[PDB]
């Protein structure tokens, strides 16, 4: 029970599609994550790509 | 029958097949990480000692899987170099490190100032320290190693 | 009182390299002369190339160089101590390293001491 | 990680993995190259040489090994029974314990050749 | 204020084992036994019983600190025998000796009373 | 101005005991405050022991600025100072 307000979401009186697009973009921004490189100490280890 | 010296095939070993000859024989220590890897697992070195009139020829073997098919080869082993790893001894004569180290001479090479591994302290092996900067003590460390090896050889009454 | 105990270094070299027995030495006389002479110019107390720095450096090590030359003499090395080549190089390197370790450290509060 | 897995193989450290896997695989590759029935050239040249040798010596079946440039760590076993038979290519994988052909592990190259000949005889 | 409870000298905690055996890998066929809540009374008895066995090559004990009630024993035997078996034989032998000693004492006391 | 060029550095090339103590303390504090470690730790947990391990392998990312009495200074990396 999140929608506790009786907002008049009539299709002729409410921009349903823009709300859906904005909410989808807000979920697509909540999917953002943080990442970083890995450091390993080994004599034969080198931080290189496959071709490198 | 020349005696056999067994080295650890681990990449973290300070003594490898690339620089074992120049270290044990010539008395100069070079970093094995910078030296290229050696394709041959068998090498021959010469030791000059005051206890013996003639130089002694010794064979250095990295892997015992292809060179110790006969049990009589283990009678020629006079020194074992280990890195403190249990998996070195899967195919050895004594799969338990303890019995192997009471029945054979164990040597561990570490840089001066580094901490000894826990397994090394729990085993009967000698600890030899190589300084990172000063290079004059390499001959002294090699002399300690060869003193232990020659004591074992005289105790075994080897003929040369 | 002087730094770097030379007697201890010599007997350590004798014990390490087994300098007993009447075996002849392979240590040539020019090697001894040049080794001692070069050792007496690597005992760095002060670093730099200025002439005053070199004069102060030569002044600071006069007594220790006298001690080293009195001990590491050619006849003494060949007859009393009976060093070989490896023992000689080990003694020279050990003398240099131990002299480097005996210098005072900057930041010492020598006044309070 | 304390446990490292390379397929079904299980190891406890990087050095153990290296010594037990990579060195053994390199030894098997060296043995395969040093074998008399090996050719390191291109696949088309290998097929042409096999065709020419089969045409010249059609009384016997000829088999050769070559590098799998498309799939690294593998080998192509090309054998031609006779000039009228199409060239059939088999996949051999370089494992630490030997060579894997037709889900069978052969310790050495000669054992691999003997197993290949036995399989051809049984399938005939 | 900092005085430990007197019953801690002989009462064994729930999480503390009475006996812990570890091998001594420096020499072959040697173990280190740690006895908890014991003192010289058992240690000296076991040590001097074990020292008379032909197959026991080394036996010793030490109480590290008198403020802690524990001792540590080192035991080394021949190749054929295991040290734990020697310890069990020693315990059984001392029990038998005490049994016959008690029997003879009771006999003599009954005779003299 | 006050900086001294790396070619004409005249101070001792050895790490003094005060510099060693200060570097170990600073590195231990940084490690205890979640700084990345530059050496492979096997089972070590104490920050001071990890700092000592880093020092023995010449992997401490710190610079020592030695001050002369006149005000000038020399910058020495922890990896180019000899440590016993």
From TrEMBL, chain A:
Q: Which domain of life is it from?
A: Eukaryota
The compartments listed are: Chromosome; Nucleus
What function does this protein fulfil? Answer: Plays a role in maintenance of chromatin structure during RNA polymerase II transcription elongation thereby repressing transcription initiation from cryptic promoters. Mediates the reassembly of nucleosomes onto the promoters of at least a selected set of genes during repression; the nucleosome reassembly is essential for transcriptional repression. Histone H3-H4 chaperone that plays a role in maintenance of chromatin structure during RNA polymerase II transcription elongation thereby repressing transcription initiation from cryptic promoters. Mediates the reassembly of nucleosomes onto the promoters of at least a selected set of genes during repression; the nucleosome reassembly is essential for transcriptional repression. Essential for viability.
Q: Which family does it belong to?
A: Belongs to the SPT6 family.
Recorded protein name is Transcription elongation factor Spt6
Q: Which residues of the full protein are shown?
A: 1242 to 1293 of 1500
TrEMBL record, chain B:
Per UniProt, residues of the Cell division control protein 73 C-terminal domain are: 1-151
From the Swiss-Prot or TrEMBL record, state where the protein is found. Nucleus
User: Record's family?
Assistant: Belongs to the CDC73 family.
Q: What is this protein called?
A: Constituent of Paf1 complex with RNA polymerase II, Paf1p, Hpr1p, Ctr9, Leo1, Rtf1 and Ccr4p
Q: Which organism is it from?
A: Komagataella phaffii (strain GS115 / ATCC 20864)
Included stretch of the parent chain = 206 to 365 of 365
From TrEMBL, chain E:
The UniProt entry, under Pfam families, shows: RNA_pol_L_2
Cellular component GO terms held in the UniProt record: RNA polymerase II, core complex
Q: What Gene Ontology molecular function terms does this protein carry?
A: DNA binding; DNA-directed RNA polymerase activity; protein dimerization activity; RNA-directed RNA polymerase activity
Q: Which UniProt keywords are present, listed alphabetically? A: DNA-directed RNA polymerase, Nucleus, Transcription
DNA-directed RNA polymerase RBP11-like dimerisation domain span: 30-102
Where the protein is mainly located, per its record?
nucleus
Source organism, top-level taxon: Eukaryota
Subcellular localization is given as: Nucleus
Annotated GO biological processes are:
termination of RNA polymerase II transcription; transcription elongation by RNA polymerase II; transcription initiation at RNA polymerase II promoter
HAMAP family, per this entry? Answer: RNApol_arch_Rpo11 (MF_00261)
Which family does the similarity line name?
Belongs to the archaeal Rpo11/eukaryotic RPB11/RPC19 RNA polymerase subunit family.
Q: What is this protein called?
A: RNA polymerase II subunit B12.5
Biological source species: Komagataella phaffii (strain GS115 / ATCC 20864)
Automatic annotation (TrEMBL), chain F:
Signal peptide limits: none
Q: Which of UniProt's keywords are assigned here? A: DNA-directed RNA polymerase, Nucleus, Phosphoprotein, Transcription
GO cellular component: a single term: RNA polymerase II, core complex
Where's it mainly located?
nucleus
Subcellular location(s): the record lists:
Nucleus
Q: Which GO terms describe its molecular function?
A: DNA binding; DNA-directed RNA polymerase activity
Can you tell me which family this protein belongs to? Belongs to the archaeal Rpo6/eukaryotic RPB6 RNA polymerase subunit family.
- The name this protein carries in UniProt is DNA-directed RNA polymerases I, II, and III subunit RPABC2
């Amino acid at each position: 029970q999140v929608a506790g307000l009786n907002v008049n979401r009539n299709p002729k009186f409410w921009d349903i599609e823009s709300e859906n697009r904005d909410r989808q973009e807000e979920i697509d921004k909540q999917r953002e994550e943080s990442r970083e490189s890995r450091v390993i100490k080994h004599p034969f280890f080198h931080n290189m790509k496959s071709k490198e | 029958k020349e005696p056999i010296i067994v080295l650890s095939p681990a990449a973290s070993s300070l003594v490898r097949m690339s620089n074992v000859k120049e270290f044990l024989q010539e008395g100069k220590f070079l970093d094995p990480s910078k030296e290229p890897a050696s394709s041959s697992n068998l090498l021959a070195i010469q030791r000059k000692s005051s206890r013996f009139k003639t130089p002694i020829k010794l064979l250095v073997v990295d892997n015992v899987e292809k060179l110790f098919t006969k049990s009589e080869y283990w009678d020629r082993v006079v020194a074992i170099v280990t890195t403190g790893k249990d998996w070195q001894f899967k195919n050895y004569k004594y799969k338990d490190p303890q019995i192997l180290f009471q029945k054979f001479n164990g040597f561990y090479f570490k840089y001066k100032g580094d901490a000894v591994p826990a397994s090394v302290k729990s085993w009967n092996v000698k600890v030899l320290d190589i300084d990172r900067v000063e290079r004059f003590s390499d001959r002294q460390v090699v002399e300690q190693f060869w003193d232990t090896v020659e004591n074992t050889l005289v105790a075994k009454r080897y003929k040369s | 009182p002087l730094p770097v105990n030379l007697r201890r270094i010599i007997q350590n070299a004798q014990q390490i390299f087994h300098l007993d027995r009447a075996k002849a030495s392979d240590l040539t006389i020019p090697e001894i002369i040049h080794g001692v002479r070069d050792l007496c110019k690597k005992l760095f107390v002060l670093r730099g190339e200025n002439e005053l720095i070199k004069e102060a450096q030569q002044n600071a090590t006069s007594l220790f160089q006298c001690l080293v030359r009195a001990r590491l003499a050619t006849r003494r090395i060949l007859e009393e101590f009976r060093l070989n080549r490896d023992a000689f190089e080990w003694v020279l390197g050990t003398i240099e390293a131990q002299f480097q370790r005996s210098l005072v450290h900057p930041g010492e509060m020598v006044g309070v001491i | 990680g304390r446990v490292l897995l390379v397929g079904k193989y299980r190891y406890h450290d990087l050095d153990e993995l290296l010594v037990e896997y990579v060195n053994n695989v390199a030894n098997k590759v060296e043995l395969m190259v040093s074998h008399d029935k090996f050719m390191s050239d291109s696949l088309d040249y290998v097929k042409e040489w096999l065709e020419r040798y089969s045409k010249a010596n059609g009384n016997r079946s000829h088999y050769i090994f070559t590098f799998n440039r498309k799939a690294p760590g593998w080998f192509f076993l090309l054998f031609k029974l006779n000039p009228t038979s199409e060239i059939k290519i088999w996949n051999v994988k370089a494992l630490p314990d030997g060579y894997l052909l037709a889900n069978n592990v052969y310790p050495d190259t000669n054992s691999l050749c003997n197993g290949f000949k036995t399989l051809m005889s049984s399938r005939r | 204020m900092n005085a430990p409870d007197r019953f801690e000298l002989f009462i064994l905690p729930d999480d503390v084992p009475k006996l812990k055996i570890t091998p001594d890998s420096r020499v072959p066929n040697c173990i280190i036994i740690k006895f908890e809540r014991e003192d010289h009374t058992l240690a000296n008895l076991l040590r001097e019983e074990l020292a008379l066995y032909p197959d026991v090559t080394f036996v010793a004990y030490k109480v590290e600190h008198p403020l802690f009630a524990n001792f540590v024993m080192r035991l080394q035997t021949e190749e054929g025998t295991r040290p734990k078996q020697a310890l069990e034989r020693a315990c059984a032998s001392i029990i038998n000796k005490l049994k016959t000693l008690d029997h003879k004492f009771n006999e003599e006391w009954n005779i003299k009373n | 101005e006050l900086a001294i060029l790396k070619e004409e550095r005249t101070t001792t090339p050895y790490l003094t005991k005060y510099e060693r103590a200060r570097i170990l303390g600073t590195r231990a504090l940084q490690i205890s405050m979640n700084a990345p470690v530059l050496v492979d730790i096997e089972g070590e947990t104490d920050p001071l022991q990890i700092a000592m391990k880093e020092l023995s392998q010449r992997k401490i990312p710190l610079v020592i600025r030695r001050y002369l009495p006149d005000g000038s200074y020399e910058d020495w990396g922890c990896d180019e100072l000899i440590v016993d």
